[PDB]
Design goal:
Bound molecules: sodium ion
Strand order of the largest sheet: 1-9-8-12-13-14-11-10
CATH topology of the largest domain: Thrombin, subunit H
CATH superfamily of the largest domain: Trypsin-like serine proteases
Strand content: 25-35%
Number of helices: 2
Oligomer: monomer
Helix content: under 10%
Shape: globular
Catalytic activity: Hydrolysis of proteins, including elastin. Preferential cleavage: Ala-|-Xaa
Largest sheet: 8 strands, antiparallel
Structural class: mainly beta
Keywords: Calcium, Disulfide bond, Hydrolase, Metal-binding, Protease, Secreted, Serine protease, Signal, Zymogen
InterPro entries: Peptidase_S1_Elastase_sf, Peptidase_S1_PA, Peptidase_S1_PA_chymotrypsin, Peptidase_S1A, Trypsin_dom, TRYPSIN_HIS, TRYPSIN_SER
Order of helices and strands: EEEEEEEEEEHEEEEH
GO molecular function, one term: serine-type endopeptidase activity
CATH architecture of the largest domain: Beta Barrel
Radius of gyration: 16 Å
Number of strands: 14
Family: Belongs to the peptidase S1 family. Elastase subfamily.
């Protein structure tokens, strides 16, 4: 997250870190949201690679023991069947991960609340992106969980020629685009939390940014719109 601030450690308890085994170690690769005790939602493009993955919940500092982490293997990966890896702009950038064990809930580990199907945010709605992603274009991962305030940009504006044009689809949410704050590599898969009727909900799964860089004016971060996939998600979970 570029232009973010450190999150409080009990602010975003559904945020997870998706890690892959990198020699003797594990490395953060993207974010996600805990949606059941044994299921995680992330971006499809985060699990394109044939790697060994684990989820970490209750994580705040990637490089320090917080005393709150639970580490769980990924047992099954269900990518959206219409996902096409060389076509992120087509959409369907969403995947569900079944965890080897169910995690235990506490003030650091909670289920993400999903919006109701079909819900669309008004232009300029207050939202936060969270993650451990790069803190500058071509920079390095954050140590501690970051948050940035990224007001939504509605489809009409986002899909205009000076923004994203036809690349953005109705099944996406855009947010930010001020040139200062944005998503960045390593934030993919993580949540966009938007305050609606007094309650944060996860409206977006971080999907892409410009190739011109993370924080670029009129290129708001693009998220998979979670409210477009509620049926898909429930169907997956029910059939597994
Ligand atoms: Na930690």
């Amino acid at each position: 997250v570029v232009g973010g601030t450190e999150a409080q450690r009990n602010s975003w308890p559904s945020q997870i870190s998706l890690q892959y085994r990198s020699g003797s170690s594990w490395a953060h690769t993207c974010g996600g949201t805990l949606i059941r005790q044994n299921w995680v939602m992330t971006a499809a493009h985060c699990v394109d690679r044939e790697l060994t993955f684990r989820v970490v919940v209750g994580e705040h500092n990637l490089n320090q023991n917080n005393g709150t982490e639970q580490y769980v293997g990924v047992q099954k990966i269900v990518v959206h069947p219409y996902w096409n890896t060389d076509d992120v702009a087509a959409g369907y950038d969403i995947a569900l991960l079944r965890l080897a064990q169910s995690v235990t809930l506490n003030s650091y580990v909670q289920l993400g609340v999903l919006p109701r199907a079909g819900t669309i945010l008004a232009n300029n709605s207050p939202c936060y992106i969270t993650g451990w992603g790069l803190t500058r274009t071509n920079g390095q991962l954050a140590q501690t969980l970051q948050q940035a305030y990224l007001p939504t940009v509605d489809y009409a504006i986002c899909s205009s020629s000076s923004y994203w044009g036809s690349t953005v689809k109705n099944s996406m949410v855009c947010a930010g685009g001020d040139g200062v704050r944005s998503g960045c590599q390593g934030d993919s898969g993580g949540p966009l939390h938007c305050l609606v009727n007094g309650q944060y909900a996860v409206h977006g799964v971080t999907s892409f940014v410009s190739r011109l860089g993370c924080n670029v004016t009129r290129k708001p971060t693009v998220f998979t719109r979670v409210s477009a996939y509620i049926s898909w998600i429930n169907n997956v979970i029910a059939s597994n």
